[PDB]
Design a protein around this ligand. Structure first.
Ligand code: MG
Ligand code: MG
Ligand code: MG
Ligand code: MG
Ligand code: MG
Ligand code: MG
Ligand code: MG
Ligand code: MG
Ligand code: MG
Ligand code: MG
Ligand code: MG
Ligand code: MG
Ligand code: MG
Ligand code: MG
Lengths: 215, 110, 146, 177, 48, 205
RNA sequence: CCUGCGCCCGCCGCCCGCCCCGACCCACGUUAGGGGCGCUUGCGCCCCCAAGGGCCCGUGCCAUUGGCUAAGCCGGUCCG
RNA sequence: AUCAACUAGCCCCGAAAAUGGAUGGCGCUGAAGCGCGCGACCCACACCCGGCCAUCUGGGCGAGUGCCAUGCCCCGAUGAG
RNA sequence: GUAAGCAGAACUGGCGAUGCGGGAUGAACCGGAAGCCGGGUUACGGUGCCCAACUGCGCGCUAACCUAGAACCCACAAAGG
RNA sequence: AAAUUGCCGGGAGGGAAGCGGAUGGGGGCCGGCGAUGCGCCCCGGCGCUCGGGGCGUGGACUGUUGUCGGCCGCGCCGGCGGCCAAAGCCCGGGGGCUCCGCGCCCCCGGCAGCCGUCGUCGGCACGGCCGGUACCCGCGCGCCGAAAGGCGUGCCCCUCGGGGCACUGCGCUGCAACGCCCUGCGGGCUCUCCAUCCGACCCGUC
């Protein structure tokens, strides 16, 4: 259908439908609108000697990243990298940037709600049921870093005080975690051994061949 | 091994460096040859096409608080029939790196 | 020197260059004198079409111009009522009144080295080598050099 | 799968001349690895037997002959002419195969083995399906025996696929025939 | 998939008679043997 | 031959009834690939073509010597372990740093000295006599060749092996008893656990 | 025999450096044969193809704060 | 059941030289030899696709907001000495 | 001319003037001719180790107590058994 | 100044050394080696520029991922056509062979399960290298939609799905998301030494 869709797109009729020149033939009577001429600034503060070329706010609209077919909500994922490498977690939903939203759950694994790039994940066959878990409270900005400056070089005074301080994960996020994992564990407690399964990590014991091993 | 000490999840597969892409009178350092533990056919190594690899070694002086150094790579394509792969790294592997071990990861997963 | 001259006339002056020929007693007797140097056969619709689209370049004012579009054909041939790549295919395949013009228009094809290899290049196709006439089996060789 | 060799009917005649608007038509059954090599060998025999060259000739039809019952075992005889290092000879052979294509492939193989004769040096005169009770060679006759029974005295030790190849093994391979 | 009258009758029985008779007649032509009774010397060796 | 691809600390190979050339070729690529190999029981390595051909081949080897200084000349070893090492050296580039390092990873012994007698001894199928030689084609043992070309430690290797093989057989019997009581334990425990082991029934053999 | 101001050994306080990532596993013998188990000591039974097997908390951020602890298993150390 | 000639494959004899010694070496014997095949594979500065440098070819730039015009830009092919 | 890596001619090509891959090694044998690079694929030749690539799938022949035998040119072997 | 020599510090060495390509380890050196500015704004003083904050941005070099193109390599699956296709399968018929490979071989006619060869059409999954848009694609001009994308009318077509064509206009027009380091035990280096693999005979001359 890649070529079939491509043939459909370039059809002269269908691109007229797609762009919507009908319903722009509506507003401005029996014609297609005109335009005007911006950039009447008349106030250059500076005059560059290079032949200027202004800032790009691109009109190109990149297609959204694809989700691998076997990443379906409730499926258990294995994390392949990062500090939670080997941890088995629950797949909740794909986010707007394409990153997958996952939960340990933190009661079981110690893995909180976090983004994981689909590349660093192998989907297992087992399925949890999460279609009574509520996840819209999460979005990409929830994880937005709001990173600060470079001035706080971790120095001998600061090394363990940061550990001995607590100005970190704020109260609402830890309250969030209790909401989701409380709901999650009920369906997890249904499936025998599913609680043990998540608490353990995946590992390559000698003689385990990934290209053979079905997941 | 009961009550061992060491890193304690293995998410990688061991691989060994065999040398560079060769003819009997010419050598091409840009592509190295890597034997991967447990692959034994040219069709079995299609699974690893693209997977990242790390040659981890120890240098004589500390930099960033460790003596460990790492150069990363990826598996490109099979080499021959028996399951040897052509490996490309950011820098050409050391000539002394051959006969050593590389870590083949599952990261850019499909 | 005689083999060298004929291959110039056949527009084959580099290895794995390909061109299209009319059968003639005049033509067949030129291939008989350079046969160890060339492989040839009878192309079909798929081979003639894919060669011309994928690897077809035009000879516009002595210059090698890719046939990315139909206007190149119109300005190239035009006078002979050849307007599109699809009629350029037809003109070549069913050898037509302007096969001379539409076949000289096409610059010699630049082919890949054959994916999968050759047999012994030094022998005739009949012996098991690769030279000479391989009539319809030229299409299998087109798939692997195109 | 593919047979390395194929049997062909090739039909041809001289060109119509200002006399003889109906020259005589000839056919052969030829063995070759494709149609192109079949047509070439047709014009070999027809130049040296019936004195018609490809140039002054015309090709009429070429068809591949297939085996009617590939699932059964037929005995075969092949009458062949060949060239040695010091002359020419006639040789007769018996073969057992499910297809006559298979029978011919063995023949070329045993000529290149037992006599170092190459394919460009062998001409097949006659082929036949010699029914048993008339097979001549002793090798072919010892298999014309219901209650046939024998062990496998040679048996390859090898994994199902190369996937299961190792270099080292704990125990020696365990063999018994 | 739903067993519509796939490849229904292209032609009749009598044509199917002559069609299959004709190709089969061409079959004896293809596999026909020469008698080999030209070669008196080799008649015994040839088996004919 | 590419290499085993194994992560063993070393691989001990019981070279009995292996083929010298095929075994040496397998071992040589392993050494180049960074692996360490121990080869034991080199007196038991087999060579195709009988003793007579192999004796003649070795005595042509004794003829080669630097005429003006034989001590500088080719060095003709008699012990089977050294015969194996030079055959392997022939298959390695030994005049480079890389080939020098490869030969360092090889240890070869006559018989099975400690600690290699209480270690598992692997066999290389690609070089075994049963699979590489047709029964009825002449062969000799590398121990037999050495005896006839001047190796004077055949008998001591024979004395030591009998004491080892006897010492190993009582261990065979001791494990034979321990295997049987463990087997009866297998049943007795596997009846104590009933359905609780049901997941293992379809994947057992 | 072992440096009179020189050295050696043993315990814990560890800190680097080094290797590794489960860096687990002993029958002989032959292969036109062999293996395990019972009883005539040979006969029966079962198994013979690859370690392609067995073993091992195999599951803890090289590993959370404390207490308790069977039977079983692994290490260090004592002695024999 | 057997006898006799002939024929042609590999093998063996015919087949002797001086430093020590060469299928390139080690080695190989259901070959790692010889003859014929089947699948892949490996290997050139050669072929294909792309970037860049140079040569050669053919083009565009004034009632000039116009340029080291001996300049910039575009097109195609080419490159041993 | 007994012959010669000998002397003299005819047609074509090569070396000389030319690197590169293969023939272990070689001016003219086989492939192929070249700017500096990335990726792909080939030719001759190969795929037990040296040495990149199968101890791959098939069928026969050979057993050498002579260094069996194993690369176009090419590094011989004959009459005769 | 060089040849050549001594001392101090450093480095390497199994019958040469030096050399060309790679890279790894050490050195030694590099701050234009690598940025912290610009637009809205609120005053408080001199519409223009500095002083405080409020504001979105924004920096060598390098990392990962996504998405679009181009070229390539690999794997799977489906349809159609030719041949007498044959065949196995189910049914029916036809010839001699003489105790035998014997429940033998060969032959033909119907048909409704699989399976060559040659040609062709289609879909799908994986992977490598390059590129990132001033036109080709793409965006705004209407609404819905987070975004994919959808939404209108009329003629023709089968008539399910839905399909195909239609009038076309104005302008605009460098793809993204997150990172790491920031005087450091950092980053790179065309410089020096050394190690290793591959290559590698001393020039000039006739
Ligand atoms: Mg390929
Ligand atoms: Mg070839
Ligand atoms: Mg030639
Ligand atoms: Mg190799
Ligand atoms: Mg010019
Ligand atoms: Mg060029
Ligand atoms: Mg001169
Ligand atoms: Mg290349
Ligand atoms: Mg000086
Ligand atoms: Mg000094
Ligand atoms: Mg160097
Ligand atoms: Mg350096
Ligand atoms: Mg793409
Ligand atoms: Mg029939």
């Amino acid at each position: 259908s890649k070529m079939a869709l491509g043939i459909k797109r370039a059809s002269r009729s269908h691109t007229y439908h797609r762009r919507g020149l009908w319903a722009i033939k509506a507003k401005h009577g029996g014609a297609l609108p005109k335009a005007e001429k911006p950039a009447a600034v008349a106030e250059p503060k500076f005059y560059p000697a290079d032949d200027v070329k202004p800032r790009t706010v691109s009109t190109r609209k990149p297609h959204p990243t694809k989700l691998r077919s076997t990443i379906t909500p409730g499926t258990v994922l294995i994390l392949l990298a990062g500090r939670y490498m080997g941890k088995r977690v629950v797949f909740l939903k794909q986010l707007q940037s394409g990153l997958l939203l996952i939960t340990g759950p933190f009661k079981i694994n110690g893995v909180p709600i976090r983004r994981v790039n689909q590349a660093y994940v192998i989907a297992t066959s087992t399925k949890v049921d999460i279609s009574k878990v509520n996840v819209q409270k999460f979005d990409d900005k929830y994880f937005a870093r709001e990173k600060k400056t470079r001035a706080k070089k971790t120095e001998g005074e600061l090394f363990e005080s940061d550990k001995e301080a607590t100005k970190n994960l704020p109260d609402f996020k830890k309250d969030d975690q209790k909401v989701i994992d409380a709901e999650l564990i009920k369906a997890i407690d249904a499936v025998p051994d599913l609680k043990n399964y998540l608490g353990a990590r995946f590992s390559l014991r000698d003689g385990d061949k990934p290209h053979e091993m079905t997941f | 091994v009961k009550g061992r000490t060491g890193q304690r999840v293995r998410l990688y597969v061991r691989g060994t460096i065999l040398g560079y892409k060769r003819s009997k009178s010419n050598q091409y350092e840009t592509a190295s040859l890597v034997q991967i533990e447990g692959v034994n056919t040219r069709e079995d190594v299609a699974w690893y096409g693209g997977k990242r690899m790390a040659y981890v070694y120890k240098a004589k002086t500390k930099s960033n608080g460790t003596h460990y150094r790492c150069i990363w790579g990826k598996v490109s394509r099979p080499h021959g029939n028996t399951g040897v792969v052509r490996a490309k790294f950011t820098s050409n592997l050391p000539a002394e790196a051959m006969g050593k071990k590389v870590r083949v990861f599952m990261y850019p997963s499909s | 020197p005689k083999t060298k001259k004929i291959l110039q006339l056949l527009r084959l002056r580099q290895i794995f260059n390909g061109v299209f020929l009319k059968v003639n007693k005049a033509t067949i007797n030129m291939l008989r004198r350079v046969e160890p140097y060339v492989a040839y056969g009878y192309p079909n619709l798929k081979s003639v079409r894919e060669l011309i689209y994928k690897r077809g370049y035009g000879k516009l004012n002595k210059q090698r111009i890719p046939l990315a579009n139909n206007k190149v054909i119109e300005e190239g041939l035009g006078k002979h009522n050849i307007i599109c790549i699809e009629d350029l295919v037809h003109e070549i395949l069913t050898v037509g009144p302007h096969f001379k013009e539409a076949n000289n228009f096409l610059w010699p094809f630049k082919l890949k080295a054959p994916l999968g290899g050759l047999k012994k290049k030094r022998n005739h196709y009949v012996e098991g080598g690769d030279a000479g006439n391989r009539e319809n089996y030229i299409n299998q060789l087109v798939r692997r050099m195109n | 799968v593919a047979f390395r060799f194929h049997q062909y009917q090739v039909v041809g005649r001289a060109l119509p001349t200002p006399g003889d608007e109906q020259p005589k038509i000839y056919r052969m059954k030829l063995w070759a690895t494709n149609e192109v090599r079949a047509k070439s060998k047709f014009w070999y025999f027809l130049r040296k037997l019936k004195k018609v060259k490809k140039s002054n000739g015309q090709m009429l039809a070429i068809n591949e002959i297939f085996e009617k019952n590939p699932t059964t075992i037929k005995n075969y005889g092949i009458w062949l002419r060949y060239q040695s290092r010091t002359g020419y000879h006639n040789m007769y052979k018996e073969y057992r195969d499910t297809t006559l294509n298979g029978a011919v492939e063995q023949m070329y193989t045993e000529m290149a083995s037992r006599h170092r004769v190459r394919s460009p040096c062998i001409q097949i005169i006659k082929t036949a399906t010699v029914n048993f009770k008339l097979c001549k060679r002793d090798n072919t006759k010892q298999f014309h025996n219901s209650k046939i029974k024998f062990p496998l005295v040679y048996q390859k030790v090898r994994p199902p696929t190369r996937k299961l190849k190792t270099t080292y093994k704990a125990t020696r391979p365990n063999l018994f025939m | 998939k739903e067993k519509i009258n796939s490849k229904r009758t292209k032609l009749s029985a009598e044509e199917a008679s002559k069609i299959k008779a004709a190709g089969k007649a061409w079959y004896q032509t293809m596999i026909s043997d020469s008698d080999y009774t030209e070669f008196d010397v080799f008649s015994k060796w040839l088996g004919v | 031959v590419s290499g085993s691809g194994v992560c063993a600390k070393r691989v001990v190979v019981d070279a009995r009834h292996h083929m010298l050339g095929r075994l040496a070729s397998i071992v040589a690529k392993e050494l180049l690939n960074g692996q360490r190999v121990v080869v034991v029981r080199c007196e038991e390595i087999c060579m195709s073509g009988g003793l007579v051909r192999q004796k003649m081949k070795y005595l042509r080897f004794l003829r080669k010597r630097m005429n003006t200084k034989p001590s500088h000349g080719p060095i003709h070893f008699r012990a089977p372990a050294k015969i194996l090492w030079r055959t392997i050296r022939g298959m390695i580039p030994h005049k480079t740093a890389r080939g020098e390092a490869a030969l360092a990873r090889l240890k070869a012994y006559e018989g099975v000295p400690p600690p290699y007698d209480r270690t598992k001894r692997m066999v290389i199928p690609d070089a075994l006599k049963v699979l590489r030689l047709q029964p009825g084609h002449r062969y000799c043992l590398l121990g037999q060749l050495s005896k006839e070309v001047g190796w004077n430690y055949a008998d001591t290797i024979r004395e030591l092996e009998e004491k080892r093989k006897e010492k190993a057989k009582v261990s065979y019997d001791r494990r034979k008893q321990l295997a049987k009581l463990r087997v009866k334990a297998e049943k007795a425990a596997e009846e104590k656990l009933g359905t609780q082991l049901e997941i293992l029934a379809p994947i057992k053999y």
